Design an enzyme around this catalytic site. Structure first.
Site, PDB file in Angstrom:
ATOM      1  N   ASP A   1       0.829  -1.205   0.000  1.00 15.72           N
ATOM      2  CA  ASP A   1       0.000   0.000   0.000  1.00 15.72           C
ATOM      3  C   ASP A   1       0.867   1.261   0.000  1.00 15.72           C
ATOM      4  O   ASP A   1       1.933   1.308   0.625  1.00 15.72           O
ATOM      5  CB  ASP A   1      -0.945  -0.020   1.204  1.00 15.72           C
ATOM      6  CG  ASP A   1      -1.983   1.070   1.135  1.00 15.72           C
ATOM      7  OD1 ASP A   1      -2.517   1.288   0.029  1.00 15.72           O
ATOM      8  OD2 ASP A   1      -2.266   1.713   2.174  1.00 15.72           O
ATOM      9  N   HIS A   2       0.414   2.271  -0.738  1.00 11.49           N
ATOM     10  CA  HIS A   2       1.046   3.590  -0.772  1.00 11.49           C
ATOM     11  C   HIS A   2       2.539   3.495  -1.082  1.00 11.49           C
ATOM     12  O   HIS A   2       3.396   3.863  -0.277  1.00 11.49           O
ATOM     13  CB  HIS A   2       0.793   4.344   0.534  1.00 11.49           C
ATOM     14  CG  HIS A   2      -0.531   5.033   0.553  1.00 11.49           C
ATOM     15  ND1 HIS A   2      -1.053   5.656  -0.563  1.00 11.49           N
ATOM     16  CD2 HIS A   2      -1.468   5.147   1.521  1.00 11.49           C
ATOM     17  CE1 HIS A   2      -2.245   6.142  -0.276  1.00 11.49           C
ATOM     18  NE2 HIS A   2      -2.519   5.852   0.981  1.00 11.49           N
TER      19      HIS A   2
ATOM     20  N   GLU B   1      -3.598  -0.578  -8.424  1.00  9.69           N
ATOM     21  CA  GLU B   1      -4.392   0.519  -7.899  1.00  9.69           C
ATOM     22  C   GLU B   1      -3.598   1.806  -8.004  1.00  9.69           C
ATOM     23  O   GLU B   1      -2.420   1.853  -7.639  1.00  9.69           O
ATOM     24  CB  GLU B   1      -4.801   0.293  -6.447  1.00  9.69           C
ATOM     25  CG  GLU B   1      -5.250   1.580  -5.790  1.00  9.69           C
ATOM     26  CD  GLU B   1      -5.958   1.361  -4.485  1.00  9.69           C
ATOM     27  OE1 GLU B   1      -5.532   1.963  -3.480  1.00  9.69           O
ATOM     28  OE2 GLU B   1      -6.939   0.589  -4.457  1.00  9.69           O
TER      29      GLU B   1
ATOM     30  N   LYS C   1      -8.463   9.838   9.703  1.00 12.40           N
ATOM     31  CA  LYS C   1      -8.243   8.533  10.307  1.00 12.40           C
ATOM     32  C   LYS C   1      -9.121   8.354  11.532  1.00 12.40           C
ATOM     33  O   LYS C   1      -9.115   9.192  12.437  1.00 12.40           O
ATOM     34  CB  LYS C   1      -6.785   8.374  10.702  1.00 12.40           C
ATOM     35  CG  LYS C   1      -5.911   7.955   9.570  1.00 12.40           C
ATOM     36  CD  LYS C   1      -6.368   6.650   9.007  1.00 12.40           C
ATOM     37  CE  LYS C   1      -5.216   5.953   8.293  1.00 12.40           C
ATOM     38  NZ  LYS C   1      -4.973   4.513   8.716  1.00 12.40           N
TER      39      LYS C   1
ATOM     40  N   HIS D   1     -10.027   4.852   0.474  1.00 13.07           N
ATOM     41  CA  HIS D   1      -9.008   4.938   1.490  1.00 13.07           C
ATOM     42  C   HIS D   1      -9.566   5.616   2.727  1.00 13.07           C
ATOM     43  O   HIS D   1     -10.588   6.302   2.677  1.00 13.07           O
ATOM     44  CB  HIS D   1      -7.806   5.688   0.948  1.00 13.07           C
ATOM     45  CG  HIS D   1      -7.028   4.896  -0.045  1.00 13.07           C
ATOM     46  ND1 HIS D   1      -5.661   4.766   0.010  1.00 13.07           N
ATOM     47  CD2 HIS D   1      -7.432   4.153  -1.101  1.00 13.07           C
ATOM     48  CE1 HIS D   1      -5.252   3.990  -0.978  1.00 13.07           C
ATOM     49  NE2 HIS D   1      -6.307   3.612  -1.674  1.00 13.07           N
TER      50      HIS D   1
HETATM   51 ZN   LIG Z   1      -4.276   4.602   2.242  1.00  8.91          ZN
END
Ligand SMILES: [Zn+2]
Length: 489
Positions: free
Chosen positions: A159-160, A268, A310, A342
């Site tokens: 991810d990222h 992605e 978050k 996300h």
């Molecule tokens: Zn993320």
């Protein structure tokens, strides 16, 4: 060598066996075992499996540490343990575990649901803050599906990723999904600038580049769904400026690593982290370039209007967001990839809309909220431990805000001296205390005394090992709310 006397405690039904964990490979039978508070690998038989597993011997029985090595061995014999891609035509969920212990519970939430788990999922950021490697992330995922007999297959998502070094690495370790984060080639300047200025910066581009976009896009109308997307000069120039270079990054990486990779990969593309929210027409233009250059997109993750912080629910006008959501979604269908949400955990206000508008074809990434449910357990189970870390999060908050965008009001957290012990878990219902505990996770885990032992982490993992069926019960509940609100059948 003989402390593998554990096996006889198992003979008498005095150790927890994991019911669904028995699986054979030719002559060897392997099942999973927790004993003395440690999970174990237990095999009897003969064959290339038995001989390849590392462990102490005793009988025709071996006791194996749940190791990276032994899972590479389980990878050789048991293919469900290996990650696998799923495609754009399905419902998926990312199940981040920053601790390596949320797997089994994650598995127990998806069994029976029409969704594919991406069991292993971490960003490069999280590997830094927690101090872990990507081998570990896959290990827990692969041991989770084994331990629970989930053979329907699961995904490993790096991810990222931004540095090419990272893409090569995630490629090397068999990640089946890759998330190219491009929030940083986004010209956040050109997005706020004025009409007479974009034009200046746009007329500073090559004729060939400017002739390109204008022939392809200018003053034409695109019927997406029941959705017309139109580009006047003012809009085209802005989006070209605002997004051009990032489009170029995606296509370069697709050609260099994704399509040369030799195996199925989910690509992605992600820009949910920009400061410029992704305008719908802008979204259209980025995919249209990516697709007209034969990039094979698994999913897009834009920056929606309002803010996805978050640990908390949506901030904004949900009416506007629905109106943006409908066109994004329509854009992703005409092109055939999925929208990727996300920061999705705890966005309870967007879930039905996301489910409806994508007719169930979506990607939703959770990660920190799982660390937060483990924090709930300490609050429920080790009040003192939680107090010790709730306070340390306090004195190191402004630190951790260098790494996540949060608008936490420190002034909404009742002081620790003010909440009873049995009132501690209710912090994990509250916006601000949640964000406080959410982003400080790297400091807590790495905290050491000047003696060098773990200030928190080892005691934290023992109580989590001890109240495991609790932890897994929490995940089943919290992650279920998510999937039901999304409409997963
Ligand atoms: Zn993320």
């Amino acid at each position: 060598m003989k402390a593998q006397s554990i096996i006889e405690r198992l003979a008498a039904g005095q150790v927890h066996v994991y019911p669904r964990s028995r699986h054979e490979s030719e002559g060897t039978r392997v099942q999973m075992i927790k004993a003395e508070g440690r999970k174990y690998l237990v095999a009897e038989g003969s064959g290339k499996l038995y001989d390849e597993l590392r462990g102490e011997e005793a009988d025709g029985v071996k006791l194996c540490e749940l190791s990276h090595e032994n899972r590479l061995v389980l990878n050789r014999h048991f293919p469900f343990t290996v990650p696998q891609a799923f495609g754009k035509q399905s419902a998926t969920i990312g199940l981040g575990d920053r601790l390596g212990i949320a797997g089994p519970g994650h598995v127990q939430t998806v069994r029976g649901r029409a969704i594919h788990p991406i069991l292993a999922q971490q960003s490069i950021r999280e590997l830094a803050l927690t101090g872990r490697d990507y081998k570990q992330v896959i290990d827990a995922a692969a041991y989770a599906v084994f331990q629970e007999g989930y053979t329907e297959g699961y995904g490993a998502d790096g991810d990222h990723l931004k540095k090419e070094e990272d893409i090569r690495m995630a490629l090397d370790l068999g990640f089946t999904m890759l998330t190219l984060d491009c929030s940083e080639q986004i010209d956040n300047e050109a997005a706020q600038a004025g009409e007479s200025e974009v034009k200046r910066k746009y007329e500073e581009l090559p004729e060939s580049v400017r002739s390109h976009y204008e022939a392809k896009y200018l003053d034409k109308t695109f019927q997406v769904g029941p959705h017309a997307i139109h580009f006047d000069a003012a809009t085209l120039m802005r989006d070209v400026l605002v997004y051009r270079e990032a489009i170029q990054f995606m296509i370069y990486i697709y050609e260099k690593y994704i399509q040369t990779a030799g195996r199925a990969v989910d690509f992605e593309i992600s820009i949910d982290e920009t400061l410029t929210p992704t305008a719908p027409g802008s979204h259209f233009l980025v995919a249209s370039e990516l697709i007209g250059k034969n990039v094979d997109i698994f999913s897009m993750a834009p920056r929606f209007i309002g803010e996805f912080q978050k640990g908390i629910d949506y901030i904004g006008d949900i009416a506007q967001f629905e109106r943006e959501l409908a066109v994004h979604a329509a854009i992703a269908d005409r092109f055939g990839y999925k929208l990727s949400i996300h920061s999705g955990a705890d966005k309870f206000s967007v879930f039905a809309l996301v489910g409806r508008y994508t007719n169930g074809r979506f990607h939703v990434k959770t990660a920190g909220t799982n660390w937060l449910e483990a924090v709930r357990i300490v609050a429920k189970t080790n009040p003192g431990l939680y107090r010790r870390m709730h306070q340390y999060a306090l004195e190191h908050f402004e630190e951790a805000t260098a790494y996540y965008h949060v608008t936490t009001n420190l002034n909404n957290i009742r002081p620790l001296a003010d909440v009873s012990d049995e009132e501690l878990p209710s912090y994990m219902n509250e916006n601000d205390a949640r964000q406080l505990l959410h982003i400080t996770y790297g400091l807590l885990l790495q905290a050491k005394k000047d003696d060098g032992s773990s200030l928190f982490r080892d005691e934290f993992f023992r109580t989590l090992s001890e109240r495991e069926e609790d932890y897994e019960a929490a995940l089943r509940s919290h992650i279920g709310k998510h999937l039901d609100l999304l409409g997963v059948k």
